[PDB]
Amino acid sequence: AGADEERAETARLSSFIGAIAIGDLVKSTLGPKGMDKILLSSGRDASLMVTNDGATILKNIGVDNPAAKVLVDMSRVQDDEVGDGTTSVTVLAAELLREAESLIAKKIHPQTIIAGWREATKAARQALLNSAVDHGSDEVKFRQDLMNIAGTTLSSKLLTHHKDHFTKLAVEAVLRLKGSGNLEAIHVIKKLGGSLADSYLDEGFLLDKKIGVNQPKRIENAKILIANTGMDTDKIKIFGSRVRVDSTAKVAEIEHAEKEKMKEKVERILKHGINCFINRQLIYNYPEQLFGAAGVMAIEHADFVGVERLALVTGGEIASTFDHPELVKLGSCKLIEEVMIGEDKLIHFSGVALGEACTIVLRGATQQILDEAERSLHDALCVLAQTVKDSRTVYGGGCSEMLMAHAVTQLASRTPGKEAVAMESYAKALRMLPTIIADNAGYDSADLVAQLRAAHSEGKTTAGLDMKEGTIGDMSVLGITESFQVKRQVLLSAAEAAEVILRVDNIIKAAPR
Amino acid sequence: AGADEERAETARLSSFIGAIAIGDLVKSTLGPKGMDKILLSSGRDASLMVTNDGATILKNIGVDNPAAKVLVDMSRVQDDEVGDGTTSVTVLAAELLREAESLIAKKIHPQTIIAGWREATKAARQALLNSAVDHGSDEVKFRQDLMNIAGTTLSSKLLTHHKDHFTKLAVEAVLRLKGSGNLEAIHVIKKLGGSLADSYLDEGFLLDKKIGVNQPKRIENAKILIANTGMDTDKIKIFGSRVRVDSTAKVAEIEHAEKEKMKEKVERILKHGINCFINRQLIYNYPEQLFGAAGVMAIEHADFVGVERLALVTGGEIASTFDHPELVKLGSCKLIEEVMIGEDKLIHFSGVALGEACTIVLRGATQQILDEAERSLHDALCVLAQTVKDSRTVYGGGCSEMLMAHAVTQLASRTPGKEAVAMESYAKALRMLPTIIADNAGYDSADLVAQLRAAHSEGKTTAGLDMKEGTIGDMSVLGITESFQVKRQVLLSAAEAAEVILRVDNIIKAAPR
Amino acid sequence: AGADEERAETARLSSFIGAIAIGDLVKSTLGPKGMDKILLSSGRDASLMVTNDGATILKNIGVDNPAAKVLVDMSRVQDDEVGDGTTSVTVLAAELLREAESLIAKKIHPQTIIAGWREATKAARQALLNSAVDHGSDEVKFRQDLMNIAGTTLSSKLLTHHKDHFTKLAVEAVLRLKGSGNLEAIHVIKKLGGSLADSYLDEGFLLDKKIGVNQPKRIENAKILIANTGMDTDKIKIFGSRVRVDSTAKVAEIEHAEKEKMKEKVERILKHGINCFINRQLIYNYPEQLFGAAGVMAIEHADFVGVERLALVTGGEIASTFDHPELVKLGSCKLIEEVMIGEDKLIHFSGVALGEACTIVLRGATQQILDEAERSLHDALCVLAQTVKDSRTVYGGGCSEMLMAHAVTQLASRTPGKEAVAMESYAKALRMLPTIIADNAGYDSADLVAQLRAAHSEGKTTAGLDMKEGTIGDMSVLGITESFQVKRQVLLSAAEAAEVILRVDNIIKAAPR
């Protein structure tokens, strides 16, 4: 079957290599001051894709044959549950593998060593219920809505110079989302024109299409018409082919028949007061001359997904044949217009009666960075939704890591012999996270770690690493916090990821269903 | 893999090399006695293109991997707002990079150095509000229209002998152009025939087509008809199919139907007084005989772009079916005729009542050099149009640069330590421009630097580098002046390109896929 | 990387190499002795073209990449002014480059050297607006029409034993083209039959074609018909299909319909008295039988180019459908006939009322030399038109070059020696020409230079190199003269063309790395 199997030394090594390669790259991402990375790939990759979110970059590609992709895939479930904020879940699992060099010296029973992973659940659950997290969002909430965790997610990201304002905007978007919808109908677009606000919140839906140069500039008391069938007429579903009437003179009636399609469209249209027509496909030329005289703005080949979303927004319609007008059609009427804001022209649909669907339009600084904002909304939508629902968070700035480390030292003394040596090694791993945060800051590491441990040991969960100061301070005053979900899941599956490879000392031979 | 990550000094170096290569080529370009350059290259290039405009050449070719294309791109946005006259903006940006080698010797914090750019605000503005330059350009004007900057723009260019006259012509074009209509409707064609004037200005629009050998030579009562649909008839979209017939005689009735189509065209046409017909497509043969007898000039397969601009000029038309004659067509009426010019035959539309759109025609001797005028005219339109709107200029020949240099010298050593080195690096950058101007003309650079600084220091703004003289002289009488917004923007444009790579906060980075 | 690597020493070399190769071929050509050269290429070239005139050979073919084709191109512009006689302008420019080797001795600044070209304008102004010319050429003028300069142009050419008579003929040709035309409508052909005249002057246009086996030999009071559309008829619009009949009687109309086409052509034709028909395309067989019996000669697939000249000649016509015979057709009638010239069979159109367009028929002895005459006509027409318009001339045979040389020697010592070496070199360029004129004569070159200079110095412009004498004599008696503006342009042109690549030190490169 072309099976690739490695015995003892080689099998273990591949996991070891996979964990180390990813650790160095992800470590710089963490913290208020993160580093943006630039990735270039060939083969269905347009240009360098720069992702600040570690989970997004791993999901996108499958670089090579060594085992690590499955470990990567699991993080998505975590994302649906919580996901982002800052990425640290992958890093802790990778360092577990490094003491394995020490482990070979033990020389014969790795399985006994394994009982530590179940023990790790003990280590992780001890962390659970231990440490005051937060009071939690009531619902909507006035000032606790943001200016907290989203900013922290952003801090590692470059756009933060104007971006932090954008993050603040996103919570407003999440609060409106809760009501009856689901987790759908959120649309964001960006504009090349520069502004300090760098974004506007629209009460309705954003679209970009035009009938033609002629027609009135704006419409009011608008009525919206949506048609399943195109305005094109002649073919039927089967030719109706070679007609041959009895000279040129009667061929004219068929041309006349076209006029009948034109007239029906205007007669029915005039009574309603129709201000806008939206059709998802091709549109017949004849009606276009007629729309301009009437003062009605139509949209040719409107995208179906936008239209379908639009329908809940406008009260909906039953789309059928030209009978479609009047009562079978329901149309919202606040205002439809093409406004000209800043430079590039677009059409704004707004004032929806339903209130169950909304759209956001962004403005940028004008450059390569502008395309960055596309990925940027998506990060914001996910961070806030979970933070309000979980109602639980933990202190950032490495505050969480030092507290747990003091507790885990005790755990090694907890077990009489073999368990103790293995359990202690897991505990020392946590120490590196605080050390790395301080080192990139531009401050002396030795002074930092000694003072750090003393504050955590005392019992203050709030106290943590302050990079700006270069010393230890109160994290809570800063307002930096990490989502509660990211911490419980990493601890539970960090052990599971390493568990499938390392515990296997020998291989049978399968692959079925 | 394939990341092209470039860390610390290597990243800085790529910016450095791009700047030095560009400056040497462009330096000879700005001056009364510029050289002129020809590029051979190969592949999709013909042979020795010669461009005197630095901005045009940088955009045309993107030769290599190092970053500079985006910096180059920004020059064009400047062109819309003024652009050229002479190209000097690119040179100043490059020189600021040379001091960076000195900076590694300092080896402290590159961010700290960045402070000089921000205080460059007090430099660009120092150039501003200091030294009155002219005062005029209120609108139209008799002799201030040219014999100024346009001559200077072309002074560098070889075509100066006969062409300086052409430059004079271009401002007349801008005067008609000016209004609240921004920039629209400008068309220029060079012709293969030589005259002393080497160009005549047409009051209307120039086109090149003919109905056929028959029909009268001159209409002089010119009325214009434009049709969206061809004169061709048969298929409609309801064929009547491929057609039988018992005998050849029956097919005769079909010909007769074609005849009716001819008659409708003439009956309506004579009443209007129709003198010329222009159709943007193929034209059916039958009407052609009709037009010839009537004394009406028609154009087959007329280009659409000419028509839309022409419509603005004539007063417009509404293009529909054969109902098109009379009132639905406005038809302007001064003079339409085909006029022989020197060598090649062309058709001229003239006498436009609206006044918004006009056309320029150039002739020339008949040279490789002659095609040069097409790109040159575009440059001519851009320099003069902004000259009137800005209403402000600066002294050329290095006068502006030496003055600014005197102010920056005080700033340098006065501030102690780390900031002084940064401030002074920018300051001596200005020194190179005086050296570069004198060196290319055949005079000793060393002597020139000493004498130049002493005159500027005294307080005479007008005095500057005179290449023909070999020393210093009064710049204003020479006729060399620089656009007002080129100087505030150039300092800012030079500043941002180098600054962005040195910002983002450290970033040692690495990244996989 | 791209563009061609030239600046400093290598760039100078390309100009240098182009000048030396061209000078040897052209040097032989100068003067009555002048040597004819044979050039061979077999694909797109009929036979070796001797091309005695230097200007004609350089323009026809651009053999290679080095710069020289553009320098060559200017000479035609000179030709438009006059630019012929015997070629000398190109040679003087080339020798300017020879002492450039001396210039590397200076080893540092070529620009000081450049001021010498300006000096040349001062030096060359003593050759134009100076000396004396001839003061004849009233325009038209019956006896001063030729036997002068055209013979001189031909003196170099070998054919001038019977050829000189041909040159005399050409002025009559220039006189007839006098008017509002320019240079158009002149056709020249040659024949293989020998006669003393070697040529004949005809009243009209010559075309080689024949109708067919049948048809009258000659027509008088001839009327000319030209048709855009061929005489082929049947399918038009809607073939009426391919027809199967029910019986013999119905098919009567098809055969008869063809007859109507025949009837229109004959009945309309008879009233006019039609003697000849010319069609630029294929012709239908039925009319062909008619033309023979009627007494009318028709031409199948007549060349369109021949037809267009003929139209000015006959007063023209409007070409369309069979409505064409009568007033819409203008016929000029003298005599149209097919005649025998010595051996070959040709058709002659003659007796043009307009007089604006004419054709020349050359016969000749039966020689390689005979094809030389075709070469001669293009040169003949250009020489005479300019001579009447300029009203000024200079003495040939090297008389012009030596006089100028005496003046330039003084100039070198006037300037400082470093400058002087560069100025003197332009001056000694003139000296080589006297040596060449004598060398082709077979007389001793050393003796000739000494005696030549002494007579020119004295002040006699008329005195020059008498090749036949072996010493020096009166050029005017010989009748050899050069037009006045050939000299004005050569002196300005020779200097700056070379100067543009020597003026500049560093140049044209884009951005390799």
Side-chain angles (χ1 to χ4, degrees), chain A residues 225-227 229 264-265 268-269 271 318-329:
Chain A
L225 192 331
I226 300 170
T229 173
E264 70 180 350
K265 291 180 180 169
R268 300 290 170 130
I269 257 206
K271 70 190 190 176
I318 300 301
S320 204
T321 60
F322 292 109
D323 290 340
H324 50 75
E326 30 115 20
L327 290 70
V328 298
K329 290 284 175 280

Side-chain angles (χ1 to χ4, degrees), chain C residues 90 92 120 183 231 236 327 338 358 432 506 509:
Chain C
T90 300
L92 290 64
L183 180 60
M231 300 240 250
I236 60 170
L327 290 71
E338 180 180 88
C358 293
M432 190 179 170
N506 64 90
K509 190 170 280 180

Side-chain angles (χ1 to χ4, degrees), chain A residues 119-382:
Chain A
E119 290 291 299
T121 300
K122 180 61 178 63
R125 70 180 190 82
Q126 240 230 209
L128 300 180
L129 280 70
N130 185 340
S131 86
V133 285
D134 69 340
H135 289 260
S137 180
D138 290 340
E139 203 250 310
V140 170
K141 180 60 176 176
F142 326 133
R143 190 90 316 203
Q144 290 300 310
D145 194 0
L146 223 162
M147 292 180 70
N148 290 331
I149 190 170
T152 300
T153 300
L154 270 54
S155 295
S156 64
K157 290 180 180 56
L158 180 60
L159 60 206
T160 308
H161 59 278
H162 283 134
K163 181 61 180 56
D164 51 50
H165 180 70
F166 280 85
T167 234
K168 181 180 180 296
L169 180 61
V171 286
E172 290 180 350
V174 300
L175 300 180
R176 70 181 180 187
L177 180 281
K178 60 179 80 178
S180 340
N182 240 205
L183 180 60
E184 290 180 271
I186 300 170
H187 180 62
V188 70
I189 270 210
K190 60 60 176 176
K191 180 60 46 56
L192 290 80
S195 70
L196 205 277
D198 290 311
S199 55
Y200 290 89
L201 190 280
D202 290 340
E203 60 288 300
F205 180 90
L206 190 280
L207 200 270
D208 190 340
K209 291 180 180 61
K210 190 180 180 176
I211 351 90
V213 170
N214 60 40
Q215 260 101 36
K217 180 61 62 183
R218 300 181 300 183
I219 60 230
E220 60 189 41
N221 290 339
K223 280 70 174 56
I224 300 123
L225 192 331
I226 300 170
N228 290 340
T229 173
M231 300 240 250
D232 290 340
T233 310
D234 60 340
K235 291 180 180 299
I236 242 277
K237 70 176 286 168
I238 220 250
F239 260 128
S241 70
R242 290 153 50 214
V243 170
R244 170 147 276 272
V245 125
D246 190 351
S247 98
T248 300
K250 180 178 280 296
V251 73
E253 71 180 349
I254 300 301
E255 197 270 330
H256 180 268
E258 177 60 30
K259 300 290 171 264
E260 180 62 10
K261 288 72 177 144
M262 179 98 100
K263 291 300 180 182
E264 70 180 350
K265 291 180 180 169
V266 68
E267 290 291 298
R268 300 290 170 130
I269 257 206
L270 180 60
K271 70 190 190 176
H272 197 199
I274 190 70
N275 299 100
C276 180
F277 180 90
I278 186 170
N279 190 340
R280 186 260 110 195
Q281 60 180 270
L282 290 310
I283 190 170
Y284 218 20
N285 290 335
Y286 290 94
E288 281 21 53
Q289 290 178 90
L290 180 60
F291 280 90
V296 180
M297 180 189 69
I299 300 170
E300 191 252 310
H301 200 270
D303 290 342
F304 180 90
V305 306
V307 170
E308 200 73 350
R309 290 180 180 151
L310 190 280
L312 290 170
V313 170
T314 198
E317 330 222 288
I318 300 301
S320 204
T321 60
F322 292 109
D323 290 340
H324 50 75
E326 30 115 20
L327 290 70
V328 298
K329 290 284 175 280
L330 290 340
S332 64
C333 50
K334 180 180 180 40
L335 180 67
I336 300 170
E337 61 180 346
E338 180 180 88
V339 81
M340 290 180 180
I341 0 110
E343 10 190 308
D344 190 49
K345 290 175 70 176
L346 0 80
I347 190 170
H348 290 89
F349 180 90
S350 65
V352 0
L354 180 70
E356 190 170 354
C358 293
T359 300
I360 300 170
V361 180
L362 300 180
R363 290 180 180 192
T366 208
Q367 76 282 110
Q368 180 70 40
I369 299 170
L370 180 60
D371 290 340
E372 180 180 350
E374 180 180 351
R375 70 190 90 119
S376 190
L377 180 70
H378 199 99
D379 290 340
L381 180 264
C382 290

Side-chain angles (χ1 to χ4, degrees), chain A residues 25 33 35-42 57 61 63 158 234-235 242-244 248 251 254-255, chain B residues 1-3 236-238 240-244 253-254 257 320 504-505 507 509-513:
Chain A
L25 290 311
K33 290 290 182 176
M35 290 101 150
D36 290 280
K37 300 300 180 224
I38 300 170
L39 290 170
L40 183 278
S41 181
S42 294
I57 190 280
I61 200 70
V63 171
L158 180 60
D234 60 340
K235 291 180 180 299
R242 290 153 50 214
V243 170
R244 170 147 276 272
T248 300
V251 73
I254 300 301
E255 197 270 330
Chain B
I236 190 170
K237 180 60 173 143
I238 300 300
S241 301
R242 290 70 80 159
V243 180
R244 210 220 340 267
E253 70 180 310
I254 300 301
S320 310
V504 170
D505 218 316
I507 60 170
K509 80 180 181 176
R513 215 91 223 89

Side-chain angles (χ1 to χ4, degrees), chain C residues 110-123 419 422-423 426 495 499:
Chain C
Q111 280 111 140
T112 300
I113 299 170
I114 299 300
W117 280 251
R118 180 160 60 207
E119 290 299 300
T121 300
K122 180 61 180 169
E419 290 110 303
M423 189 180 209
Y426 180 90
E499 181 180 350

Side-chain angles (χ1 to χ4, degrees), chain C residues 232 261 283 402:
Chain C
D232 290 340
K261 295 180 180 142
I283 190 160
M402 206 284 113

